[PDB]
């Protein structure tokens, strides 16, 4: 019921949307979903991701294809095109400290209004941030990041939507799956409903809207 075609899924990724994309340097990125969106050619996206991958791997493929208006990431060094589009003025890029990025995506999914982090103080990250003093020490108020759609990845996905992200394919995937309106998981393998233990899961079914196979 939640298992659909790739074309049915990418019908929900529409122009201008903010999109969470799981993946740490493409480790745990839904590559099949990405190539589909290369075919559809959706424009003016805001991608929220650990990094922009490579020019030939991952979120980077969207970047080089003029499909990304703005990038919210922690790292862009592995993709010299992001670097180029940033300095040229084409793409806007907010460089978010990785732990802050985790708490910011998580906050959207968990109903939090923000989190207080000491990471950033006295640096460029402080600019545009409210400083809250708690028990004498200063913190940055970092704000939730809800997105329209999350494109997440699972090495195994049962038919109800429960997801397993093995080894280091977890990253932001289990966080991103809570913090968007429409979550699409790209499954490596579709196990049967209940095949996976209630103790071994990374993402509950109640977070997944559509499952696609790679």
């Amino acid at each position: 019921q939640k298992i659909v075609s790739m074309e049915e899924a990418i019908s929900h990724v529409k122009d201008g949307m903010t999109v969470h994309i799981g993946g740490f340097i493409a480790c745990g990125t839904p590559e099949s979903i990405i190539t589909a969106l290369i075919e559809k050619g959706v424009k003016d996206l805001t991608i929220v991701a650990n990094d922009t991958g490579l020019i030939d791997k991952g979120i980077g493929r969207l970047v080089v294809n003029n499909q990304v208006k703005k990038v919210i990431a922690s790292h862009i060094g592995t993709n010299p095109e992001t670097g180029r589009r940033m300095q040229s003025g084409e793409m806007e890029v907010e460089l978010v400290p990785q732990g802050t990025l985790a708490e910011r995506v998580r906050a959207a999914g968990y109903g939090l209004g923000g989190i207080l982090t000491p990471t950033g103080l006295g640096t460029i990250v402080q600019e545009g941030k409210q400083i809250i003093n708690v028990d004498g020490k200063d913190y940055l108020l970092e704000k939730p990041i809800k997105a329209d759609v999350a494109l997440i990845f699972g090495t195994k996905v049962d038919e109800l939507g429960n997801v397993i992200c093995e080894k280091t394919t977890k990253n932001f995937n289990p966080l991103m799956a809570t913090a968007a309106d429409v979550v699409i998981v790209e499954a490596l393998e579709i196990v049967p409903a209940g095949s996976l233990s209630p103790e071994h899961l990374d993402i509950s079914r109640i977070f997944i809207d559509y499952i696609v196979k790679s």
Binding site: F24, I25, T78, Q87, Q98, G99, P118, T119, V125
Partner: protein, 214 residues
């Protein structure tokens, strides 16, 4: 006459490894700090990579692409390792559960400030997990060449964009080992490859002398 690069890196990496103890949780930054693992031997160190492994093992022979480190290279899981999402990973990092983190620097100063993620106009990769690492790590070790193509890196006040404020505990070069304390830099060691007058002329910051191992 600038030393042999592969030898500078080894002087440093071998001296960083003495700063560990059995059961230390350690995060090693990409670059010169990664060599530090060839010299820990049987010290019972537990390595953490930002992308979600605690208990990082050595590279596999001939290689899982779903299990890598913070710099995309293939790794393996040691005995007793756990795998987790990006938020848990930075709970470990931001919450003080990393005993030492090892990092390079573009500049460091007598106040313990750090610049190592951005050169304006020249290289802008992002901060990755580094801001979170130097702010949360219990002991923060900067492992760097004493000079970059002759320019002085150890200054009174940093001039480049900060990574963090007052976080550096130890500066380890091929020339020297400095401790950062409340009053300033303290020369704790002088290596066979340099002299006090050499350090004094390749260090812009004022410092005092230890206990000094020469």
């Amino acid at each position: 006459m600038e030393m042999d690069k592969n030898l500078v890196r080894e002087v440093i990496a071998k001296r960083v490894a003495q700063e560990f103890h059995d059961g230390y949780v350690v995060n090693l930054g990409i670059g010169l700090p990664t060599l530090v693992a060839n010299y820990v031997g049987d010290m019972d160190v537990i390595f953490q990579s930002e992308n979600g492994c605690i208990g990082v093992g050595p590279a596999p022979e001939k290689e899982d692409p779903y299990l890598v480190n913070a710099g995309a290279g293939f790794i393996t899981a040691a005995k007793g390792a756990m795998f987790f999402d990006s938020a848990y990973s930075f709970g470990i990092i931001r919450g003080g559960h990393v005993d030492a983190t090892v990092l390079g620097a573009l500049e460091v100063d007598e106040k313990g400030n750090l610049a190592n993620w951005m050169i304006p106009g020249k290289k802008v990769p992002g901060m990755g997990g580094a801001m979170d690492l130097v702010v949360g790590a219990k002991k923060v070790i900067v492992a760097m060449e004493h000079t970059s193509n002759g320019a002085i890196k150890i200054l009174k006040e940093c001039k480049l964009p900060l990574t963090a404020v007052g976080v550096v505990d130890l500066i380890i070069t091929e020339k020297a080992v400095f401790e950062v304390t409340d009053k300033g830099l303290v020369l704790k060691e002088i290596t066979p490859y340099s002299s006090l007058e050499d350090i004094k002329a390749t260090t812009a910051a004022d410092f005092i002398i230890a206990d000094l191992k020469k």
